[PDB]
């Protein structure tokens, strides 16, 4: 039977070249005798180039291949939460089967143009620099980009951790389920990752799709789609979901590897002509639906690894061009003490304030502005043998505001805590304080109001802004704390 | 089964079997040769012809020559009787001391440990090297990588670590030389012996050795790491011990593959590499790992072609490490050894929660100032130093002294530095830097800080220099 | 003060000119690396 089954003509470098299979559809899952699956990516006149999902040691010339008739779909819904699954949705945390009812297809088209509405609900990270100057809204696609080891995955993690404030809450329209896709990473990193998340009690609301370093190319390829589907189940059901693709750089490599082995034509950097289309069809599935559709959302934090800061290399160019903004991390900043290494001047949020809270805006706005102003003069500092007090002023606001954007890891803040601290320097209170102390000030200052003043923060929170009152109360709280502070 | 050779082109040999086609990865032995020639099956070309990679020279092979399927991937003698010995890619002793009488044999090809087999303990592994310890601490059971272009210190650094760590280590050690210098395996073997880590008379050997040097055909080079790693996995799993794995240089595994790649009929990926570089690296790097059964502390030297850290190979390897020591010819060029780049070296344990805030604040304190100085370098270059704020000409000072205090005379490089090797303890390091950063030595001269161990030697050296 | 003014006028104008040149040198180099890296891939692929 050459219609529903085929015979392997040759097998190598994970590409199977099957004879027969006359009825297979493009991208169909097929099965080799040995039990290994494969996906038909090249339907040629005289053969099927099949992408083997595993070790090609188990396939020989002549092995019989059969069709499944089924296209790639994966488990989905609420039972995956707190689980560690492979790219096919299989459980790899050895905790037992995932009790999944619904199964969704991994590659589906993004919701069209009509079914959506402007991104308007804040997606809070807990990171002041991001939350005040590079705001993410639900349905937005914001890229975290930077060289190796700059803090990229940390941003995502702090972000995931942060959602417990709302996940332990009652308001079900503020909860955000998290999905973390690990592509090309080593298993020890993910293990370490899931640990950090368990320790913070964030696994309860997180799903981990993992396609690691030793998993065949095709699984690393798929991973992001199969994780996307999982997040779509939430989006579609009036629920909100967050997805982190770590990294899109490694998946591009996986895809390039199959493309070239199937002999498709190579373009710049050896990438296939459809590499742009691989990510665009992925990153567009993130969106903010309309009430007519459930008002549910899917926010995506895709990671791209640049090289020597070459944001214009091929893949970094595509993805930058596809997403709504970028958080640019930099080594120089990192080693200079700015952690997280966000380059505030080049980072962006097309969505902008349409996603900031009124509380934040109340402060974010002037901060954004003195910083931009400092950035103009900063370089002068170190040779400012005699600058006027006009600009000498902006250098001072400059370094303090900058110290306020600093942040340790695993400790995401509540929007109310961020504005209280930002207010402190923005209003001028730390202007006479020593740069070397702002980190210590904030820490203790925030410890104090989180202890003693939970009623003002609750106000700020509730009233959503800084009332003329709470404004006055903060003035005293900081002018007395500061006095205390320099005793 | 018995196949015949149909084509020979370098390290690649195509074989035609009449009945029974040996599976991929199977090792075949060429009949009619003074020495054992193993061919690893690489692909099924179809027409009952397999394409294979030779584990040795292909000279004198003939079209039609006979080849027997061994029925299994390369399998080597694994067990305790490998310790103190020197093995081949294919498991043959190469030390002239007779057979290796192991109870068992293992195939060099195997699946990597599952996700549920991973461990997450993180213990600092002190080495005695100021720079590493201070800024990019190694971790027991972690994956360590020494990155460097030709001749910047990868091996010497591996040499001083064998001395400062392998030597006291209570557990085995496996040193796999992959595509490196033959002269070097002879230097190390004889050093192991002169120091009793290798014992030729008794069973007190604490190190097994495996070698596939630069004088070998691509094939051997594409596999020794596997052989080496396989020996190490035994002590990890079947004995459950604490292993120390040294590989110099893992880049050679990847260069090996790129060298036969075209003969395997593949369109090249970027920079000439083969399109399967990352996956080829992944299925290997994923076995070099600590599990719940045993612990591996791998120190891998990583060559950097053309000195370009973005080269697909060095570039693809960062993700497999928990700590990285990046060496730089720009630093070396100044006479600062070890030439580690203080701003490009990292460790997953550089966490206040793991090494402590004193350790952490010093490290970051040292890095800020070196960064601060890096930025000014190009500028005082042209515009000079007068206009600089006393605040800024002090960081130039302290930086230049730290830059030096980071160098150290290794005990394995006296032939190089003309200085006795010093091993500094973690607290002597943290403190020394803490004080320089604190302004406590702004009076001593930079030179006093160059090529010394502990901070006291910098003070003594100041006097000696005092005239 | 008139000589520092003059000297710093020149220095600043030389700098800018240097800036304009390095930038143009940067783009030429950027384009050639891509082209160069791509021809290398094509050559290897065509030889098969």
């Amino acid at each position: 039977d050459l219609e529903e089954t085929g015979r392997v003509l040759s097998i190598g470098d994970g590409i199977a070249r099957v004879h027969g299979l006359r009825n297979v559809q493009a991208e169909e899952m097929v099965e080799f005798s040995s039990g290994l699956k494969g996906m038909s990516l090249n339907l040629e006149p005289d053969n099927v180039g099949v992408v083997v999902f595993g070790n090609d040691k188990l396939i020989k010339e002549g092995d019989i291949v059969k069709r499944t008739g089924a296209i790639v779909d994966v488990p989905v819904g609420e039972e995956l939460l707190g689980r560690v699954v492979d790219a096919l949705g299989n459980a790899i945390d050895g905790k037992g089967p995932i009790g999944s009812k619904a199964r969704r297809r991994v590659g589906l088209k993004a919701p069209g143009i009509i079914p959506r509405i402007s991104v308007r609900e804040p997606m809070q990270t807990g990171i002041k620099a991001v939350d005040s100057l590079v705001p993410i809204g639900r349905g937005q696609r914001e890229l975290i980009i930077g060289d190796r080891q700059t803090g990229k995955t940390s941003i995502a993690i702090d972000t995931i951790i942060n959602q417990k404030r709302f996940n332990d809450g009652t308001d079900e329209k503020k909860k955000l389920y998290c999905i973390y896709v690990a592509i090309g990473q080593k298993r020890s990193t993910v293990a370490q990752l899931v640990k950090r998340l368990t320790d913070a009690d964030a696994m309860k609301y997180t799903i981990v799709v993992s396609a690691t370093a030793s998993d065949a190319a095709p699984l690393q390829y798929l991973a992001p789609y199969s994780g996307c589907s999982m997040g779509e189940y939430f989006r579609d059901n009036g629920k909100h979901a967050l997805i982190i693709y770590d990294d899109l750089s490694k998946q591009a490599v996986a895809y390039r590897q199959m493309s070239l082995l199937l002999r498709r034509p190579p373009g710049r950097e050896a990438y296939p002509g459809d590499v742009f289309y691989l990510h665009s069809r992925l990153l567009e599935r993130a969106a903010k639906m309309n009430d007519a559709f459930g008002g549910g959302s899917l926010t995506a934090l895709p990671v791209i690894e640049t090289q020597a800061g070459d944001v214009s290399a091929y893949i970094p160019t595509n993805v930058i061009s596809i997403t709504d903004g970028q958080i640019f991390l930099e080594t120089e900043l990192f080693y200079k003490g700015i952690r997280p290494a966000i380059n505030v001047g080049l980072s962006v949020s097309r969505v902008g304030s349409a996603a900031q809270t009124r509380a934040m805006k109340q402060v974010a706005g002037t901060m954004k502005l003195e910083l931009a102003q400092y950035r103009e003069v900063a370089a002068f500092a170190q040779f400012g043998s005699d600058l006027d007090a006009a600009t000498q002023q902006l250098l001072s606001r400059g370094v303090r505001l900058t110290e306020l954007l600093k942040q340790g890891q695993y400790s995401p803040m509540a929007i109310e805590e961020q504005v209280a601290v930002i207010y402190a320097g923005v209003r001028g209170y730390l202007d006479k304080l020593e740069p070397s102390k702002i980190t210590k000030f904030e820490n203790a200052f925030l410890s104090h109001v989180i202890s003693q003043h939970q009623a003002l923060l609750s106000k700020i929170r509730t009233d959503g802004k800084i009332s003329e009152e709470s404004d006055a109360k903060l003035k005293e709280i900081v002018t007395n704390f500061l006095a205390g502070f320099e005793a | 089964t018995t196949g015949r050779i149909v084509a020979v082109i370098g390290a690649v040999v195509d074989v035609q079997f009449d009945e029974g086609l040996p599976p991929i990865l199977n090792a075949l032995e060429v009949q009619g040769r003074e020495t054992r020639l193993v061919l690893e099956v690489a692909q099924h070309l179809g027409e009952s012809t397999v394409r294979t990679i030779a584990m040795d020279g292909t000279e004198g092979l003939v079209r039609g020559q006979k080849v027997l399927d061994s029925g299994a991937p390369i399998r080597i003698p694994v067990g305790p009787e490998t310790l103190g010995r020197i093995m081949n890619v294919i498991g043959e002793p190469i030390d002239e001391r007779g057979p290796i009488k192991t109870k068992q044999f293992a195939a060099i090809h195997a699946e990597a440990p599952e996700f549920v087999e991973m461990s997450v303990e993180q213990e600092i592994l002190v080495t005695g090297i100021k720079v590493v310890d201070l800024l990019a601490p190694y971790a027991k059971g972690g994956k360590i990588g020494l990155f460097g272009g030709a001749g910047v210190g990868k091996t010497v650094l591996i040499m001083e670590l064998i001395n400062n760590v392998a030597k006291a280590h209570g557990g085995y050690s496996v040193f796999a030389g992959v595509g490196e210098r033959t002269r070097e395996g002879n230097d190390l073997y004889h050093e192991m012996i002169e120091s009793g880590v290798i014992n030729l008379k008794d069973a007190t050997s604490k190190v097994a050795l495996v070698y596939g040097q630069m004088n070998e055909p691509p094939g051997a080079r594409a596999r020794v790491a596997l052989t080496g790693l396989t020996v190490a996995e035994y002590f990890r799993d079947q004995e459950g011990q604490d292993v120390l794995l040294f590989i110099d240089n893992i880049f050679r595994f990847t260069q090996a593959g790129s060298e036969v790649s075209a003969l395997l009929g593949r369109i090249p990926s970027a920079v000439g590499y083969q399109p399967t570089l990352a996956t080829d690296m992944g299925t290997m790097q994923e076995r070099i790992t600590t599990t719940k059964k045993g612990s591996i502390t791998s120190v891998q030297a990583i060559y950097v072609p053309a000195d370009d850290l973005t080269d697909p190979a060095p570039a693809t390897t960062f993700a497999h490490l928990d700590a990285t020591t990046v060496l730089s010819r720009a630093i070396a060029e100044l006479g600062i050894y070890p030439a580690v780049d203080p701003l490009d070296s990292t460790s997953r344990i550089m966490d206040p929660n793991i090494v402590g805030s004193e350790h952490y604040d010093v490290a970051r304190g040292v890095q800020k100032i070196l960064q601060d100085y890096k930025s000014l370098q190009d500028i005082i270059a042209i515009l000079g130093m007068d206009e600089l704020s006393e605040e800024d000409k002090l960081t130039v000072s302290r930086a230049r002294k730290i830059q030096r205090f980071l160098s150290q005379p290794f005990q394995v490089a006296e032939v190089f530095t003309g200085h006795l090797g010093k091993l500094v303890p973690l607290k002597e390091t943290i403190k020394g830097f803490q004080q320089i950063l604190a302004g406590e030595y702004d009076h001593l001269p930079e030179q006093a800080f160059y090529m010394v161990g502990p901070i006291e030697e910098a003070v003594a050296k100041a006097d000696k220099l005092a005239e | 003060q008139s000589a520092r003014m003059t000297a710093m006028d020149n220095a600043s104008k030389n700098a800018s000119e240097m800036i304009d040149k390095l930038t143009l040198t940067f783009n030429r180099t950027r384009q050639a690396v891509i082209t160069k890296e791509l021809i290398e891939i094509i050559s290897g692929a065509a030889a098969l």
Binding site: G309, D310, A379, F383 | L383 | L22, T29, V33
Partner: peptide
Amino acid sequence: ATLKDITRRLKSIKNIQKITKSMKM
């Protein structure tokens, strides 16, 4: 001519130009 070095030089000259224009005024 390395995009790295070129960038390193641009970095330090853009500052020079800035500090130098300031000193002029």
